[PDB]
Write a protein that binds this ligand. Structure first.
Ligand SMILES: Nc1ncnc2c1ncn2[C@@H]1O[C@H](CSCC[C@H](N)C(=O)O)[C@@H](O)[C@H]1O
Length: 274
């Protein structure tokens, strides 16, 4: 049956990450039907190579290779987003960012900018709900550039342009009332750069300069000069960069600054306007 095969795997991934879902989605793509199916019928078998291949994808994920990598796609909170080791694997915690962005977009749609887009994750989850407005993605690493461009085309969305330039580098059309961004915010020396899934993502996609504050601070200052007037700059940052990021805005910006929590652990987004 199916299940049988699954547990053959479960015993494997036992310590690496937390097992079952891995296999499920990992085999949910193979003859890969639905997950509700597999649950309903993990009765039904699979072709041999069909199976072996998985038997092999296992070791890959065993050492530690990201599942998403192996699958090559990721359900961002809502959508199918094709991925490629050159950008970040769209984390959920980027809930705050997209939820507050929206909790503030009804107030103001048109002309928005997703900084360091990466894959199109936010820009994309943003533009779909909001075609009334336009979305702009940018990145300084060619792969992510196209990687966004790709996903952008799959779900086939409208009026969003991705680009290759340093943050504001190629930008002059700042009449954005809303800029959003999940930049690199990790300490060059952080030991978490050493744990699990992160040993596999780009230093670029992850590393910030000062203390992990360099790019944050820099888009704040640089990005706010845009003159967005009442417009917002929303940013994602590690749990422990709240106060710093908080302060950051102030020394740099104008309106009430707010640090809103993500899911459980903490503050994961900080915003304020001009
Ligand atoms: N100096 C720079 N100028 C523009 N984009 C940059 C940049 N440095 C990094 N970036 C892009 O911004 C990304 C932040 S990682 C997260 C990407 C995306 N915002 C998402 O939430 O997944 C980096 O991976 C890189 O693709």
């Amino acid at each position: 049956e199916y299940q049988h095969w699954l547990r053959e795997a479960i015993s494997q991934l036992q310590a690496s990450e937390s097992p079952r879902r891995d296999a499920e989605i990992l085999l949910e793509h193979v003859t890969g039907r639905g997950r509700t199916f597999i649950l309903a019928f993990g009765e039904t078998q699979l072709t041999d190579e069909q199976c072996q291949q998985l038997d092999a994808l296992l070791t890959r994920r065993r050492d530690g290779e990201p599942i998403a990598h192996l699958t090559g796609v990721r359900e961002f909170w809502s959508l199918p987003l094709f991925v490629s080791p050159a950008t970040l694997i769209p984390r959920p915690d980027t809930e705050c960012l997209v939820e507050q962005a929206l909790a503030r977009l009804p107030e103001q749609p048109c002309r928005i900018l997703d900084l360091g887009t990466g894959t199109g994750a936010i820009a994309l989850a943003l533009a779909s709900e909001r075609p009334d407005c336009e979305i702009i993605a940018v990145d300084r690493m060619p792969d992510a550039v196209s990687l966004a461009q790709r996903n952008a085309q799959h779900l086939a969305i409208k009026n969003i342009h991705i680009l290759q330039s340093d943050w504001f580098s190629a930008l002059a059309g700042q009449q954005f009332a809303m800029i959003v961004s999940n930049p690199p915010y990790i300490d060059e020396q952080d030991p978490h750069l050493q744990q699990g899934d992160v040993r596999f993502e780009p230093l670029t996609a992850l590393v910030a300069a000062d203390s992990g504050m360099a790019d944050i601070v820099h888009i704040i200052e640089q990005s706010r000069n845009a003159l967005v007037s009442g417009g917002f700059l929303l940013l994602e940052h590690g749990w422990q960069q709240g106060e710093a990021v908080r302060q950051a805005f102030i020394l740099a910006g104008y309106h009430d600054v707010e640090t809103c929590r993500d899911y459980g652990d903490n503050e994961r987004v900080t915003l304020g306007r001009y």
